[PDB]
Amino acid sequence: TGFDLSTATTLFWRPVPVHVKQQDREDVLEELTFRILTGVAKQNHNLRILRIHISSDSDLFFLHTLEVSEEDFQSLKNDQGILVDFASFPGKIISLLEKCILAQPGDSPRFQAVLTIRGGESVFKIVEINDFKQLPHITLAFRPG
Amino acid sequence: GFDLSTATTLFWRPVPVHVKQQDREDVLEELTFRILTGVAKQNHNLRILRIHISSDSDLFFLHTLEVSEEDFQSLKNDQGILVDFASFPGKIISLLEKCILAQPGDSPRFQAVLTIRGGESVFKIVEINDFKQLPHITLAFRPGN
């Protein structure tokens, strides 16, 4: 049962500059590999699912993952003021990732991907940094597994 | 206690605001914003930023925010603000300008919202883009002068 990696469609798969924070470590800027795929559940091809994988490349192939069923999306959508439907969601995330990829140090507003790892969870956000403040454009929670 | 008699008014003009309350339709109204910097009547070495919201139609529709230099630290931290107290008002004004200039076909589209709930209100300026609505600034206001 569950997400069928077998027939999933990958929409985006490449490195993205990320500003990482752990409690007991120095801040780091790392290119992390981001992958966004849509698919369906094996036991029911009618269940639509979105999956996002974040990872540092290593021979462990170890991932942090987020999985959002179309059902989960209803709640996620309302908690973040998201205005698009489930099908359009990945594309909106991808556009934000592209701005992070494009961003250069003098930009203003500047787009930046940020990751904070605490306990068994990572919180990923894409923020804009402007002459006034930093503010989030999207926030996503990830988990190992 | 804010000392009006020695305050500098930085901004005093109308701003289109979406006024929200739970038991009535939203109302889009030009509300008058006065932004002033000054010091406490009880202490003329305590700098204070005051923002006063009023209506030309209702002389008793009144909402006020006063932020001392020390209160600003907590505000600055909570909201990822990257400027000092002296620069704070100017950034608020830039955001208010975006709301004043906003056009129906903008994307992102800026909008001023005031949500009134009992003896408290929340003022925020949000952007509405093709993906979501997200706040640029959020500020707690009290009823009266």
Residue numbers in the entry:
A (entry chain B): 14 to 158
B (entry chain A): 15 to 159
What does the paper say about this structure?
Here, we demonstrate that the centriolar protein SAS-6 forms rod-shaped homodimers that interact through their N-terminal domains to form oligomers. Proteins of the SAS-6 family comprise an N-terminal domain with the evolutionarily conserved PISA motif, followed by a segment with a predicted coiled coil and a less-conserved C-terminal region predicted to be disordered. Furthermore and in conclusion, because these residues are well conserved among SAS-6 orthologs, we propose that the self-assembly of SAS-6 homodimers into a 9-fold symmetric ring structure is a fundamental property at the root of the universal 9-fold symmetry of centrioles.
